[PDB]
């Protein structure tokens, strides 16, 4: 009845809530694994306690998170989460077999997997240059790692019968002012053209490139910038990936979505909260998230934007992290599904800016919670703060064994 | 629908949150609505947008009543010196006296309204250089000094008449388009000028003084005389109020963060809320992240009587009554939202280091049935309930607005 | 002597200053006409005194300034600068013959001409949409108008024997939050496709598109975003023009030149001084300005980056404005010419981040004035502040009498 | 070589600028070099980067003398509490005394340097919650209070011995990573802790106390207890100095605009210049627009004795002696540039409305022969001519920094 009352209110505007709920149920969010062991990894190498120690602990943790999150979703894996045996394999030598257990586990749970080559925390990545390193030998090693990484995506997609997105992000740049911006960039372009040389069926693997404005130790210059990647990706029929953390002060991904859809057709984004740097805070139901959802739903792009999460806070419960974050992007999608686009578009189309504002503003007090809650039941997940209870139980008996 | 309110009351009461208490408290927080919005900053001195602006004081007060109709609770009007009511008789700004705002006081009194006041230091001959209380020539400074001193008198006059104090705010355009060659002298001049304005004491039961900083405005982008650090220091040293403008700061600088620091040393602040979009653009206020953050500071620091909330936007691309009612209702919605947060629990989770619960519940509380509360609140208070206000605006626009 | 002493100091690094001056003599700088009459123009339908009012007054004003700016340059014209007879001709109906006095004059002074359709201050631009207005009859008007403009662009290149660049800039956006970001941009794209339908020889005309992030009344959203134009230009083999005042706080055009040049080949620019909004302050010899220049020089892009000026300061002497803004940008090119790029490239390549910083910093005190003053002597323009005298004269006798 | 200077001295002469005067005052102004840069914020408490970092007090002092070899003029060294010399002894921070800095004071005296001081409220067991003076735990609060008092005492000691006052600046890292649910009570506690630190009366002839705001740190991204607005109000009420750091501000935010407003209310003023690149990233100070604007401000406003200038930077990735010398020589160049600007004529033009000349000459001055003047100055002061100091750093790194 609570629900039922909410349903009518949306009804008056022609919003079909059941339809919205039915399409929402479908959309997959790709959850990053890094959150669970604090970017550790199993590659032979103070904060909130009981992070995962092993892939077995790591997988357990995801299932728990996943069981608190409505819908059916995906795990975004990194090259360093390889299960070599006890045998240490160098990164340019990674192969599908290194990911059997991951894949087998994903299939059992009916999940999709996404991949990323890992281009940091490594002997050959300490100069802060990787694909753009002045040393041929270093570039190859990294080129080979990415090529390897692409085949692993291909393995994933074949197996999971849903295309893997393999995304390249590199830490490349310099700390202080560079005396030359162009040539590293030329080295990066050449390196990529190599990485992407062999074709793979777009049914199994998709390729993305990710820019960053600045990082720690790359304050002043980043090789693979926005304009760089936007252009590169455009020439070579690849996907851009946009991180809500990697741009200028005041700069929004929401504003970029619709321009990008006119020329690209598929588009990847990682949502994370910047708090004044690519800080990787847990995603929150804020204005920019709402504006991103709005843009996604309105531009009829629920199958063209591959939503991924990217965030790392070690100060708080790692399961709560995943679940807060993921539950936020879904709520946001939902809110954007429950909005009168047609009346709103036709009002801006005809100059009535007055009601466009009034109504965008009024829907902020409509009963999202009554639909949000109903949805959570229908989807077998705890309904409000109830989900904290499961975390508490879980942390006690297992999270706090190790 | 009464059930909707009732179920929500249970949902909130489960936290210790008393929605009846919160609504009572909300009832009496006054918002000061700026008049600059009715007539496109036009005023009534000797001196192709959106149609049907206000054109006489009779039109601006009708307009104001009309918006006040649609806004819940009981409020204040923020007047500017250029909305002075002379006859058809030019009186210079330094010659301004209570008599020139008698019609307004009486109107406010009848409708049970507070009046705040503002000297006007833009759009005038002795402002044409873009310097004012800090102009190089004595006679220009002395003029704007006499004008501000006049405006303090008028504010004292409102306080006396309306038996609720009037904040007289001082904002000046002074600055330079391009890089300056001296940043001090003009500030020295501002200081000396303000010292002269605040010389005569006025009872604080009638009139409080504010000073408003700006980072930049157009024509005035390289440097502004009345800077943030300047007026922070001045108000402290001289026991005056800072007025803070949500629109008058750096990229990403938020006032929400400033309130706590300032309540520790000042005991009363003023705010002007407006929406900047990339500059002091003066957009209608929205229920957004920052407006809720401001509200949380006000409520949770128990500064509901310490923070004088006023609005300050000018949208002449949309209907002006609607402008008023959206903005004003948005801030009330925010205060409400802040009144329905489990502060005690949140504060305690912080002191304890339980950042998991703090974020989880802050976040959770963003889908609680705020609307059900708001709707009921709107109805006890005789305003249209959701979109409905938009229907009276449609009528008023044809009915009166557009025979004008 | 002074110059000969300076010369030796740069000569110690392998820096031939004689050669730098030789190449500096040949770089054109495209000066905007807007600055002369405060964007008035000659269409039938407070600030500092002495502003131009007539075609005749504006040509004298450009000549004055050109005569205080060393070298040979071009003038950048807008469509509202058409000289109909006393006739009145609609913007879609403008023809080469409406600019033939302009051409004759530049032939007479050895100047290139650049072009711009004007899509603002007009009835058919008053809803703030233009190439993207919902009304097809509005769009077509503007489509034709830009087409007319390209034809004029062709005229200049033919007549003057130097390609003309015809840059499109539109004011299109909304002040307040759009309820649709997608459908306005789809329309820009279709308008531009139509505009660029006819091919024109690259030796006579080039096209460029110019992004912007916001304007006044254009605050919340702007159709011609940076992502739209970069994508469009790349797909359609057109030039991107970048305006230093047209981006996010802390966002730098300098950082973009290097990547742009990897994919375009030809790049267009406008140098403005943003002061907290797109405000059009005279360009000053600043860090970003220097940085831009370095980037243009190291990258071997003097022929590849088309340097235009765009600013409008009505608060000072207008002839002063032009001469301060141009000499500055020349100045910066000079500065970058007198940089030990190869020793600096190497140290970067090599990891000697210490020398790099050290010497880039050390060059900020090198004897540029000496060189800059020599250059102005050889180029028959006044040498330090003495061009001010010539302004004071021109102001007394000519300007203050209109 | 001495005529290059001569020809240059004349060009400046024409504007009635006295270049001899300029250098004779430039010689006087002390810069305060931070010790952190020499050993990578190591310290000597009992607890991938460029090699040869300093590892002991003798080594760090030797390092320091090396950098002053190459920096013209006479200076000061900004010490941190953790650089205490306890023999083999292990003394806690609240237990720190003037004897634990005797070597330092003996050394600075022989080389004729002033010494500034900072307590250290990070890298400690009792600062792991990211809270310090604002921790909820009174004992922890007490502990740091105790430690701060201690360092005011040690600074006093510095003033007496070196016959010039020591600035003891307080910077704390207190804040939260994620959105807080209370911005006020944590600042209530800092206020209170500061009141205690400062209750112990200490002679200003010998020690001055400063307080340092930061906007965000990694791990304190959402909120810092030390608001700019908090310290700015604090220092004014309690007669202390604000210390301004060029990296602890909002994007586009400048210290150079804050100087004039501050000097007007404060008398004395400290700053740390560091290069921020998109965060308090502590890069080596470069001769840039903002460094140029700060120096103009200090010079024009007659403040060479009202602005205490310290360096604060740590770039672990270049030669650390180079870092000190590039940086210090830059602020000095900047000062020097500001000394060679026709302030009077420029001031007159602003006053007068001639923004045309104001802009034209400030720019024209950017190509005047600063290098000619700066070279002579360098020679006169017995430091390496130009780049030539890179030669002395290579000689030092080879036969010294790398016998480690
Ligand atoms: Mn990322």
């Amino acid at each position: 009845s609570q629900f039922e009352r909410a349903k009518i209110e949306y009804g008056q505007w022609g919003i079909d809530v059941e339809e919205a709920l039915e399409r929402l149920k479908q959309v997959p969010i790709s959850i990053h694994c890094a959150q669970g062991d604090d970017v550790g990894g199993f590659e032979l190498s103070g904060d909130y306690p009981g992070k995962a120690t092993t892939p077995e602990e790591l997988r357990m943790d995801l299932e728990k998170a996943l069981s608190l999150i409505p819908g059916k979703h995906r795990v975004n894996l990194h090259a360093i989460y390889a299960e070599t045996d006890g045998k240490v394999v160098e990164r340019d030598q990674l192969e599908p077999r290194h990911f059997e257990k991951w894949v087998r586990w994903a299939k059992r749970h009916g999940l999709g997997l996404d991949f990323n080559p890992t281009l940091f925390s490594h002997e050959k990545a300490k100069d802060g240059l990787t694909l753009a390193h002045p040393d041929q030998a270093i570039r190859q090693f990294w080129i080979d790692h990415c090529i390897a990484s692409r085949k692993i995506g291909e393995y994933f997609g074949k197996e999971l019968e849903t295309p893997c997105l393999t995304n390249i992000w590199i830490p490349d740049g310099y700390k202080d002012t560079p005396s030359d911006r162009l040539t590293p960039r030329k080295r990066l372009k050449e390196s990529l053209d190599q990485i992407f040389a062999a074709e793979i069926n777009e049914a199994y693997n998709l390729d993305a490139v990710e820019s960053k404005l600045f990082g720690i130790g790359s304050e002043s210059y980043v090789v693979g910038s926005h304009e760089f990647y936007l252009s590169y990706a455009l020439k070579n029929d690849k996907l851009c990936l946009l991180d809500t953390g990697h741009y200028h002060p005041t700069e929004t991904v929401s504003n970029k979505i619709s321009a990008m859809l006119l020329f690209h057709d598929k588009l990847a984004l990682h949502v994370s909260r910047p708090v004044r740097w690519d800080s990787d805070h847990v995603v929150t139901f804020d204005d920019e998230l709402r504006e991103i959802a709005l843009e996604i739903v309105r531009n009829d792009a629920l199958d063209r934007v591959l939503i991924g999460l990217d965030f790392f806070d070690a100060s708080i419960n790692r399961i709560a992290a995943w679940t807060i974050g993921t539950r936020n992007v879904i709520k946001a999608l939902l809110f954007a599904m429950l909005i009168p686009h047609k009346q709103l578009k036709e009002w801006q189309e005809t100059g009535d800016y007055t009601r466009r504002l009034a109504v965008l503003e009024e829907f902020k007090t409509y009963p999202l919670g009554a639909i949000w809650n109903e949805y959570c039941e229908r989807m077998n997940v705890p309904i409000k703060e109830e989900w904290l209870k499961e975390i508490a139980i879980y942390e006690k008996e297992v999270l706090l064994q190790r």
Side-chain angles (χ1 to χ4, degrees), chain A:
Chain A
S1 184
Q2 250 307 314
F3 181 57
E4 221 69 66
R5 302 213 192 209
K7 202 160 161 160
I8 282 155
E9 284 210 65
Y10 295 104
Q12 257 102 118
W13 285 86
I15 305 163
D16 191 339
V17 327
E18 289 292 334
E19 197 212 24
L21 290 188
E22 188 62 28
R23 60 204 183 112
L24 186 79
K25 166 184 175 171
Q26 308 294 297
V27 356
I29 314 304
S30 182
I31 293 160
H32 52 307
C33 54
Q35 175 62 270
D37 60 343
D38 306 345
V39 212
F42 324 129
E43 185 200 45
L44 51 311
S45 286
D47 286 322
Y48 200 92
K51 67 169 187 209
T53 270
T54 45
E56 285 89 2
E57 282 163 355
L58 189 47
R59 294 190 261 286
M60 263 221 186
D61 288 349
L62 286 147
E63 299 180 50
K64 221 310 126 40
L66 267 350
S67 82
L68 303 176
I69 304 163
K72 288 198 296 86
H73 298 118
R74 14 214 300 143
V75 179
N76 200 324
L77 287 169
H78 253 283
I80 60 168
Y81 289 71
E83 276 143 301
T84 81
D85 209 55
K87 277 186 93 321
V88 35
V89 351
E90 272 324 292
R91 293 195 194 171
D92 59 326
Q93 287 302 134
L94 271 54
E95 298 172 301
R97 54 169 199 254
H98 300 312
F99 282 94
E100 230 147 56
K101 280 176 156 67
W102 273 116
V103 167
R104 196 218 294 114
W105 162 89
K107 177 132 74 175
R108 190 169 46 256
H109 300 81
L111 292 169
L113 285 185
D114 292 298
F115 206 42
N116 322 245
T118 297
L119 296 96
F120 55 90
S121 318
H122 188 285
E123 261 304 300
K124 300 176 187 287
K126 62 87 196 315
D127 294 338
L129 286 176
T130 257
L131 304 178
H133 201 291
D135 195 337
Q136 237 269 14
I138 302 302
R139 307 190 297 262
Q140 204 66 60
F141 167 91
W142 287 122
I143 306 190
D144 288 16
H145 176 38
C146 290
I147 289 168
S149 286
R150 292 191 61 219
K151 273 136 160 61
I152 293 166
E154 155 158 70
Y155 171 79
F156 281 16
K158 280 180 166 155
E159 294 285 324
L160 283 340
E161 283 189 276
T162 182
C164 177
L165 178 63
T166 313
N167 158 268
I168 296 162
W169 178 81
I170 78 189
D172 294 36
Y174 297 104
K175 183 189 210 212
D176 224 321
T177 324
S179 53
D180 181 1
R181 299 195 161 87
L182 168 63
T183 147
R185 270 147 193 201
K186 212 211 292 269
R187 285 204 258 268
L188 174 58
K189 168 178 179 303
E190 287 156 355
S191 296
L192 287 173
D193 286 2
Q194 241 153 297
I195 281 133
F196 299 136
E199 321 219 76
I200 286 176
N201 192 326
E202 276 174 38
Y204 309 133
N205 192 68
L206 286 158
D207 285 301
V209 290
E210 190 180 349
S211 74
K212 204 181 249 237
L213 174 55
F214 85 89
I216 38 162
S218 18
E219 265 87 13
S220 283
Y221 167 77
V222 163
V223 195
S225 65
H226 188 37
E227 292 77 30
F228 184 84
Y229 279 134
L230 201 154
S231 287
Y232 183 95
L234 196 88
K235 267 264 144 64
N236 305 105
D237 195 25
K238 302 291 155 147
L239 272 77
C240 269
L241 195 145
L242 325 171
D243 216 295
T244 48
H246 293 207
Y247 300 96
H248 298 85
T250 76
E251 178 161 25
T252 65
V253 176
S254 64
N255 181 49
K256 301 181 193 311
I257 292 175
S258 70
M260 217 92 46
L261 263 8
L262 253 11
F263 296 92
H264 289 266
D265 88 61
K266 234 176 270 283
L267 186 262
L269 39 102
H270 290 153
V271 317
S272 57
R273 200 144 49 89
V275 191
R276 311 206 175 261
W277 70 287
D278 185 288
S279 62
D280 282 74
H281 284 70
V282 170
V283 171
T284 56
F285 193 61
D286 55 29
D287 289 330
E288 171 62 357
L289 185 51
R290 287 184 275 282
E291 212 68 27
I292 287 186
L294 270 191
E295 232 22 79
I296 295 176
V297 148
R298 221 190 245 159
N299 307 356
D300 181 20
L302 294 168
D303 296 349
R304 311 215 271 138
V305 180
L306 301 34
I307 297 159
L309 292 202
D310 197 317
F311 56 68
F312 170 53
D313 187 14
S315 65
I316 66 147
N317 189 292
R318 287 140 186 117
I319 293 81
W322 278 317
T323 103
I324 286 161
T326 318
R327 292 169 68 109
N328 279 353
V329 337
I330 296 150
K331 261 174 283 181
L333 293 161
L334 167 62
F335 160 97
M337 282 187 192
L338 307 177
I339 285 255
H341 302 297
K342 32 281 143 46
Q343 296 92 311
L344 281 164
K345 295 177 156 167
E346 183 205 322
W347 280 328
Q348 140 172 337
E349 199 69 15
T350 57
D352 210 348
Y353 299 138
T354 316
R355 35 243 303 185
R356 184 192 50 198
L357 188 62
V359 352
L360 279 175
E361 286 297 300
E362 289 299 340
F363 272 84
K364 294 195 188 161
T365 59
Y366 271 52
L368 183 55
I371 325 308
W372 175 233
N373 302 169
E374 177 70 5
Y375 178 71
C376 277
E377 322 220 357
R378 294 188 183 182
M379 295 289 107
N380 281 340
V381 303
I383 57 125
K384 295 138 70 176
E385 316 89 46
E386 254 74 283
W387 56 262
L388 255 353
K389 286 317 314 159
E390 299 287 297
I391 315 254
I393 279 161
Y394 179 72
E395 185 191 307
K396 205 161 285 123
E397 88 228 337
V398 245
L399 279 200
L400 292 165
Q401 273 165 174
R402 333 148 162 175

